[PDB]
Amino acid sequence: MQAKPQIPKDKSKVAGYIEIPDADIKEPVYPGPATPEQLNRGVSFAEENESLDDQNISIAGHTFIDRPNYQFTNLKAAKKGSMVYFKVGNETRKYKMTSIRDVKPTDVGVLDEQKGKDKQLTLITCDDYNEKTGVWEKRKIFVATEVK
């Protein structure tokens, strides 16, 4: 009877949306993985089989110097104590940035998916673009604690 949202086969449908008031951002949520094909629409779940109720829901997206309304360009402005909202189907969950870190361009472990008691929302936003090697050197990924 109640709502029952589930990443369907419409890899083309936003599974939901995401916004942050302290960062002033509002964008769609497409199904993982954040592979180029998906990143073509919006912040996709850093992982394909992400769960609607995963102990850690990760998401990733490129950044834009000339565009703060991009995937995660205006995030660098948001920080701890930041109230984060996650909208999906007719349900609106909530998270609050509890931890933030960075790592070389290969620490995939950022997907950080272990804490379950207090689920979380692993944010992933790449930046520090290099023009010599033509690639992103530093990686930015914030974790958020479920509060709803």
Binding site: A34, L39, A46, G61, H62, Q71, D107, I124, I141
Partner: peptide
């Protein structure tokens, strides 16, 4: 880590 995804997101290039």
């Amino acid at each position: 880590l995804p997101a290039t």
